[PDB]
Design a protein around this ligand. Structure first.
Ligand SMILES: CC(C)(C)C[C@@H](O)CC(=O)O
Ligand SMILES: CC(C)(C)C[C@@H](O)CC(=O)O
Ligand SMILES: [Fe+3]
Ligand SMILES: [Fe+3]
Ligand SMILES: [Fe+3]
Ligand SMILES: [Fe+3]
Ligand code: NA
Ligand code: NA
Lengths: 327, 338
């Protein structure tokens, strides 16, 4: 508790440095048709022509990702549940509160940009997406970080890397289908995530230095709970298994898979020097061995899962007018 | 300086005991997702054959709406877009904050559902303003990023008494504001924009009703605490949620936006007075007895304040000069009268 107050100066010098000043930040308008341009109408027209060459399954993944981004208020609330770092007034001048608010401000651009791209595309049912967003924010999320900044920051380090990987992959696909402007959208959001992930990972690195036992134990606890996706409760008013189905599509398309999850786990183990730690408590060594260790186990389970996998299985999605895509 | 957790921890029991009451009296003011309007209901339909035509028509109608009005509408939209700030406010509130992110308490259910409803407000206004071609979206986006980064300091001190009084007041304020902007939209010949504003206003009426009902109940079971909290918030003055607004050039941006909204008749100090007087009546403040010196001080203050403010503000129109014009980045540094 006092550790985070004692780390305030450190955070100003080591965490806040990863924020881009508002003056130097990209904005959604940089990547959208310019509504004051004499060419606005043509720019929208061109966006729509490019979108016609993008298949439905990519739009399912892109919409799921946009909906996740749009639930931002949920995520700021999560960070603000964490003892030691939470903003106690809404304007607290602590390094930690300044970070939460500025991170949230950067994140807000992601949902904005993807929303308007999707709106202009004409390839998706915006009303059904809007319904899904309302259900999602109403449902919240249950990632089990409790009131722990250890859990919160470990979870966020993991999940920002996951979204970085997802967006980079989505950019690659956008470029594949001939849509450079959508590739740039995904690339810009991905660059935010790389930076955010680096910042959160740095915080946990410092915590591991000051208290290796508490940190490794929290890492193991989070991994046992599993890194639950932020929009795990998504629902559109018709598909009670919407998240499972969206996730299946995202996997098949190569945007995000169980193997990426394993890669992130092993990345963080390395970055926090978890395998190389020594002089831990009995509980600490148990946690160390568990996380070390978990990666290869999940990778083998995934390999066996792929081995026994039967043929999917096409599914309607309200987001694309009940048109069907392969699971 | 900051003050946190001013509510005595004993009173946590009150809100716990009111969970059932809140399901039956507060949650009833939410509309189901299936019955909710959505932004798409009021925007050109991107799957329609006539999408391009519909966008052209929105833009043609927008041309007939003055810059002054757009300044106020943008200010309104920027305020709406800072929604993460407001959910965090509710989620730092003793006795009602969501303990897990999905807590099945009445209070957390309300916070999440209210936030979900609020999300549509910004979404709709954002896309309207984007399509209009009348405003600088990049500057608006910069303003929003500054605002979320700044947060707000409305001084409700983690208290549901202070917080719910504040939200009762402010939801009524935004209702009046949206009702007036809808009325102006129709006057400028833009029926769809009128509907946009009217739909957001209809949410605010329900939300204001719900928050007002909570404070009414608190006034019934805890009259002293509630009236003291009411006087406390009025003494500090009801701070606008976007009071820290900044666009990277105008350090007095909030004051200037407020002056414009006041001049064009969207929201003014007399509306503020009307809300105060309405809430004094609604919570039966004058009709209270059984207080209690500091509570009697509070009751006196709150009942006498409204008359004092409008003496007074009318006066100060009166001594008021002859307003200069100011550029606003939101409208490409074009100028409107303050
Ligand atoms: C880790 C969270 C809960 C902060 C969610 C985060 O991935 C959202 C985002 O960065 O888009
Ligand atoms: C009162 C607040 C802080 C909940 C803000 C609210 O007025 C914003 C809104 O309802 O649009
Ligand atoms: Fe994001
Ligand atoms: Fe992110
Ligand atoms: Fe609103
Ligand atoms: Fe509201
Ligand atoms: Na958003
Ligand atoms: Na928004």
């Amino acid at each position: 508790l006092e550790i985070f107050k004692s780390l305030d100066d450190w955070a100003r010098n080591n965490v806040l440095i990863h924020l881009k000043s508002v003056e130097k930040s990209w904005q959604p308008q940089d990547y959208l048709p310019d509504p004051v341009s004499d060419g606005f109408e043509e720019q929208v027209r061109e966006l729509r022509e490019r979108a016609k060459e993008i298949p439905d399954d990519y739009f399912v993944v892109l919409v799921g990702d946009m909906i996740t981004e749009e639930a931002l208020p949920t995520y700021m609330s999560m960070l603000n549940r964490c003892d030691g770092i939470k903003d106690e007034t809404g304007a607290e001048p602590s390094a930690w509160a300044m970070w939460t608010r500025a991170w949230t401000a950067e994140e807000n651009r992601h949902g904005d940009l993807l929303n308007k791209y999707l709106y202009l595309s004409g390839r998706v049912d915006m009303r059904k997406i809007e319904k899904t967003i309302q259900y999602l924010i109403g449902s919240g999320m249950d990632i089990k970080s409790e009131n722990s900044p250890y859990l919160g920051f470990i979870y966020t380090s993991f999940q920002e890397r996951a979204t970085f990987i997802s967006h980079a992959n989505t950019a690659k696909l956008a470029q594949h289908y001939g849509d450079k402007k959508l590739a740039h959208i995904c690339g810009s959001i991905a660059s935010d995530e790389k930076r955010h992930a680096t910042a959160y990972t740095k915080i946990v690195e410092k915590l591991a230095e000051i208290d290796p036992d508490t940190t490794v134990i929290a890492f193991a606890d989070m991994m046992r709970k599993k890194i639950t996706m932020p929009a795990h409760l998504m629902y559109d008013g018709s598909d009670e298994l919407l998240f499972k189905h969206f996730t299946a599509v995202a996997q098949r398309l190569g945007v995000y898979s169980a193997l990426d999850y394993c890669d992130i786990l092993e990345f963080l183990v390395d970055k926090w020097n978890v395998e190389r730690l020594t002089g831990l408590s009995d509980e600490g060594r148990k946690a160390q061995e568990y996380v070390c260790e978990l990666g290869p186990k999940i990778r083998r389970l995934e390999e066996r899962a792929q081995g026994r996998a039967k043929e999917a299985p096409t599914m309607p999605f309200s987001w694309i007018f009940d048109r069907q895509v392969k699971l």
